Subunit: 318 residues, 3 copies
């Protein structure tokens, strides 16, 4: 109930770095006129009579975290001085910054899930959680349920692939918008989190050979006279590479038929007379030959195998 018989004077004074110029930092009281001197005198403006001390130049933890001042009191006769230390406290006045605002990269569509796609780095000059950077994916373009599941970002700024890519069935391109925030702190005596400007990552997906070729038509038939000579054109078939970022050349072969030898095919899909034809032998089978054509890409697929497709063609003898 009875008050302490002493007070306590620290050798230091602690100011927050967001203390505005012209605010009162503190009052000097005795225990006459007061002053502040020495190389850091210009941080303060002292009222010599009242002891009122205002901040006269901005504080900044990032450059001058602490400094000394000399305080003086005078009774007219003698000036007594003491040194005082100023601790400047950090506040969340810096943002996370990246060195560029746009990035680009290419990735293979077979990139495995859990692979790092690209890494960004933002730095924030504050200390503590005010300096501790987190990353966020804000938007993915094109925006589909699937594009928003495709990529994810880690605390270190690495973007990881989270689902499988497809140049031909999903998208050849993505643009990700990101930001970086700090993990919060204080500014003007209340919570404050700072965020970066938006940044963009352009991703090109590279088409790899893993889709088989497809014939242009579900049906092909044609007719040929029974006396047609060796090498007569009958018809052209076409199959094309489903990997549209590749469009590998296709070749063809006759893999099977009713009447082996009667027809063959060139690399360019043209089916020709390759033997003596005979309308009379086909009177049982509707005067018709059925022929299986196989289309094969020139290069092997990603698994080191042939990329092929096949189908049957009907040909009318006369």
């Amino acid at each position: 109930n009875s008050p302490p018989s002493f007070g306590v004077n620290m050798t230091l004074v602690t100011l927050p770095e967001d203390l505005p110029v012209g605010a009162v930092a503190f009052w000097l009281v005795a225990t006459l006129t007061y002053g502040i001197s020495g190389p850091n005198a210009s941080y303060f403006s002292v009222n010599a009579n009242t002891g009122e001390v205002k901040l006269a130049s901005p504080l900044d933890f990032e450059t001058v975290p602490f400094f000394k001042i000399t305080i003086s009191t005078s009774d007219g006769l003698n000036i007594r001085t003491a040194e005082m230390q100023v601790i400047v406290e950090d506040r969340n006045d810096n943002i996370p910054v990246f060195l560029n605002t746009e990035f680009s990269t290419s990735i293979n569509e077979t990139l495995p899930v859990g692979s790092v796609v690209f890494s960004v780095l933002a730095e924030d000059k504050d200390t503590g959680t005010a300096g501790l950077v987190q990353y966020f994916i804000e938007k993915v373009i094109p925006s589909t349920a699937n594009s928003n599941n495709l990529f994810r970002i880690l605390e270190n700024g690495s973007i990881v692939l989270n689902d499988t890519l497809s140049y031909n069935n999903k998208s050849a391109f993505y643009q990700l918008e990101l930001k970086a925030c700090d993990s919060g702190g204080i500014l003007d005596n209340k919570p404050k989190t700072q965020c970066s400007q938006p940044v963009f990552v352009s991703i090109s997906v590279i088409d790899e050979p893993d889709l088989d070729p497809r014939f242009i038509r579900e049906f092909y038939s044609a007719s040929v006279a029974e006396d047609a000579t060796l090498g007569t054109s009958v018809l052209t078939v076409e199959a094309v590479d489903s990997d549209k970022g590749i469009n590998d050349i296709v070749t063809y072969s006759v893999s099977n038929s009713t009447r082996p030898g009667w027809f063959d095919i060139r690399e360019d899909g043209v089916i020709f007379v390759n033997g003596s034809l005979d309308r009379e032998q086909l009177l049982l089978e509707n005067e018709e030959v059925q022929i299986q054509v196989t289309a094969t890409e020139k290069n092997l697929n990603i698994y080191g195998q042939e990329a092929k497709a096949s189908m049957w063609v009907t040909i009318r003898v006369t």
Copy 2:
């Protein structure tokens, strides 16, 4: 050695938010009777004679981070007042909270490793590391060396798949227990970390068609008389889909034999007489026919191919 000739009076007072009601917050001293007035007067109780100031209502950084008070001194004749600011300091008095305590989801058993399975979010109202949420997987049920390797959790609350699933060979279901803690702070002047209540994630694994069918028996044989007519039942074989979450229908065909044509098989696994049989032709081969039966699932597997199995069957002619 000689003491400073001044003291220093700040314009503010800093209290921790866990200061208990009724504790002494501070003493007012001159430089008579003291008072506290203005809209925030009820935070304090002042002893007018001694200057003792107790906290009279709870402090709470989360709602009132700072506020002003008016302090007054009186000598009987005149009342002098000054404003004083109260900075309330954050302490770790909040826990990480999730919006529900149980979650459920389904995933395909072919989900690739490094995929996100499910994401939870906990929030903690404190600021700084006291507010910074970390996640933990506490338990996995069923508990095996393998179930505890299967899933892992990231700092953002995403549960990532770390090993491969199997509906049929591992488990159709998992239940994960999690918690969220903050990254520590101070409460009553010592370190304090806060944790959430337990939360649970129920995972259903979806069976996908990637296991071939299996015959019920390692051996099948039967007997048939040599004069048995076209279509006589001989025996039933059975193969079933190993994907037990699917149980796809199976069909059968005779893929090979000694004596092509003598036997065939129906979709329901029944092997029948499909030709004239002749005991005398088999006197060299133990009066026996061997037959290869192939079972094929009706739907294609995940890789777009036939799910098949085969075996040989012995049949005794008379």
Copy 3:
């Protein structure tokens, strides 16, 4: 402009834990001689006349975060005492520590991307960001563009596989050097981040059977006289397992030829006369037999299939 008519005396004093022994902690002033007493008296050394109080024993937040002292003033006649609390503030004076400096583990080369390879844990005794551990991969040996893309580390200390392994085509071994730092704090009034001693993780990659066997030579031919008897050696071919961590045994079979039956091959690669040979029948085909040899590993590959390779061999009859 006119100074406040009171000062404010807190019941506590706050010191940073890096306050050096022998520095002035504070001055006691009245409101005669001063003293400090009670069980924690030895933390301070008081000048009884001047009120100068120096720190007399090291402060340490990690063991004694706060403690009480009794301060006394005497006028000769009576001694008045009050208790004062000392709050010790945490500073970043501890480093992240791991329990060992070297670790080792083995992983299968088919380990999927996004799998955890190994986990380390460092702990740092400080509180707040000064206690919050981050991990870094400093070096990978051997150092190639590819080895530095292979592994990545998460905030929880798990090393994740980021690209595909190969015992035979990349490396059977890696050594990773890591460190752990805290997330910064203050020491002697300025920012300070602490780092661990280096730690090493030795990774053995286990060779799995997923590469086919390869013949030693691109060409083999030999000669045999036309009257050579049943079982005469002609030549030895050799194929070996490309999985050099395995070196599975290989067997051979003749998969095809011009003149079926004339030659066969043993498990040890030796090709022998297996029929009556006849130089005269081969006068059209350059007195030569061409033979396809297939080499097959004894064990199935990781996908449950045969690991095979084939080639043609020419054999001169006389």
